[PDB]
């Protein structure tokens, strides 16, 4: 299972370039992950967090990327916010879980870290699962970049600190499930 291999890959993709991944033929060893007291936000939807290990699904896609520390509050199915209209619109039929935690102490350096970006100007609201990498000039008339450098700092508070997030998404279609079999 390339799970923490996705998580502890030292660099991530951005919130607009959110990297889903194909997961199949695996054990359902989620329990040691939420017994590992290192993650912070534990919000599962459709299936109970302890019940994700028992019941198995198809179409596993983990969306791992970096967002702000106060904007995990804006992470919910159908919550309309700055993350929903421009970065990525979350689905209302979302069956899965979202997990975030801080690792700012290695993300931060003495100077302003200008490597990743975030979509502060997009043209109109997204659908579920939309990836628009169209980084064109913004007609707002007054014409700025559609992305901006994340101004973060170690002096910035934890709500203004970067979090590593993962969104496990499941879709039940006509196929046998390929995740459960562990803890049997």
């Amino acid at each position: 299972c390339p799970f923490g291999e996705v998580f502890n890959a030292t660099r991530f993709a951005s919130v607009y370039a959110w990297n889903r991944k194909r997961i199949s033929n695996c054990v359902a060893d989620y329990s040691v992950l939420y017994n590992s007291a290192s993650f912070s936000t534990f919000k599962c939807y459709g299936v109970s967090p302890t019940k994700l290990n028992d019941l198995c699904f198809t179409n596993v896609y983990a969306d791992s990327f970096v967002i702000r520390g106060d904007e995990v509050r804006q992470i919910a199915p159908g919550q309309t916010g700055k993350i929903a209209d421009y970065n990525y619109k979350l689905p209302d039929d979302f069956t899965g879980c979202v997990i975030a935690w801080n690792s700012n102490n290695l993300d931060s350096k003495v100077g302003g870290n200008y490597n990743y970006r975030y979509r502060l100007f997009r043209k109109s609201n997204l659908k579920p699962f939309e990836r628009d990498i169209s980084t064109e000039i913004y007609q707002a008339g007054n014409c700025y970049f559609p992305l901006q450098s994340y101004g973060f700092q170690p002096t910035n508070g934890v709500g203004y600190q970067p979090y590593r997030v993962v969104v496990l998404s499941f879709e039940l279609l006509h196929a046998p499930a390929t995740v459960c079999g562990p803890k049997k």
Partner: antibody, heavy 121, light 110 residues
Framework: QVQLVQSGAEVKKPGESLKISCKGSGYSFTSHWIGWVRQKPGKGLEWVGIIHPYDSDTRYSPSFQGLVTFSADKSSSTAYLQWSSLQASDTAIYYC??????????????WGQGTTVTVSS | QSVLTQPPSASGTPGQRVTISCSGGSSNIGGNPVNWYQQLPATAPKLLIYNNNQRPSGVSDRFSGSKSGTSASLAISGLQSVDEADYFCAAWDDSLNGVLFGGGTKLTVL
């Protein structure tokens, strides 16, 4: 009229260089991704790449990286597709593509009209 | 060519409603919204449908689309002789970072 204009019917020799052109007119040129589209005759629709003309930002097919050479200039309002080496697999009708990025969706509403590059033997 | 399964040949009387079904991997149709295209023979292609139901400038109201997750359907009601063209279930996706294309849907009248 928004149009990505490719030139007339193109003939050269293989192995050499050719920079085919695609004028962007009737619209704000560098505000849409311009997609270079391939069509070898008798096949399902083929793809080469798509390029933003600002700093030549590149989203291309990973199985032709470095073979096909792209450029797109704002002041010339022209996307340029170059091959430093031509072959028999290049012989195809090529199209351009203007993505309808106007506070709308993606899809490519305006196309290139089609230009066949050939070698005659 | 990409993994976007499309019927290459359809037919029907003038006035019929064809249904072009398309499916594949969830990174193709389930992730990004399915778009639809149409190319007349020896001409340029043309966009029909974006964002699973929305049309660009210059296409009629017969062309309608739907997306059911990774599945998709083009509905074209009231056929005429304009339907001598191959249709594409095709979208800009980040499966292999491309505007991934379909296998054509060319129709003739009989």
């Amino acid at each position: 009229q928004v149009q990505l204009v490719q030139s007339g019917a193109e003939v050269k020799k293989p192995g050499e260089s050719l920079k085919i052109s695609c004028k962007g007119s009737g619209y704000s040129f560098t505000s849409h991704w311009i997609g270079w589209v391939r069509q070898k005759p008798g096949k399902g629709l083929e793809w080469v790449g798509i390029i933003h003309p600002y700093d030549s930002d590149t989203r291309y097919s990973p199985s032709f990286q470095g073979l096909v050479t792209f450029s797109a200039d704002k002041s010339s309002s022209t996307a340029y597709l170059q091959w430093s080496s031509l072959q028999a697999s290049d012989t195809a009708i090529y199209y351009c593509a203007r993505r309808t990025d106007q506070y709308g969706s993606h899809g490519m509403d305006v196309w290139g009209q089609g230009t066949t590059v050939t070698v005659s033997s | 060519q990409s993994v976007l399964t499309q019927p290459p040949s359809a037919s029907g009387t003038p006035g019929q409603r064809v249904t072009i079904s398309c499916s594949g991997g969830s990174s193709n149709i389930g992730g990004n919204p399915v778009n639809w295209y149409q190319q007349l023979p020896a001409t340029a292609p043309k966009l029909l449908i974006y964002n699973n139901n929305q049309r660009p400038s210059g296409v009629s109201d017969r062309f309608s689309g739907s997306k059911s997750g990774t599945s998709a359907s083009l509905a074209i009601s009231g056929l005429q002789s304009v339907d001598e063209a191959d249709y594409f279930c095709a979208a800009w996706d980040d499966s292999l970072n491309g505007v991934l294309f379909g296998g054509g849907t060319k129709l003739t009248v009989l």
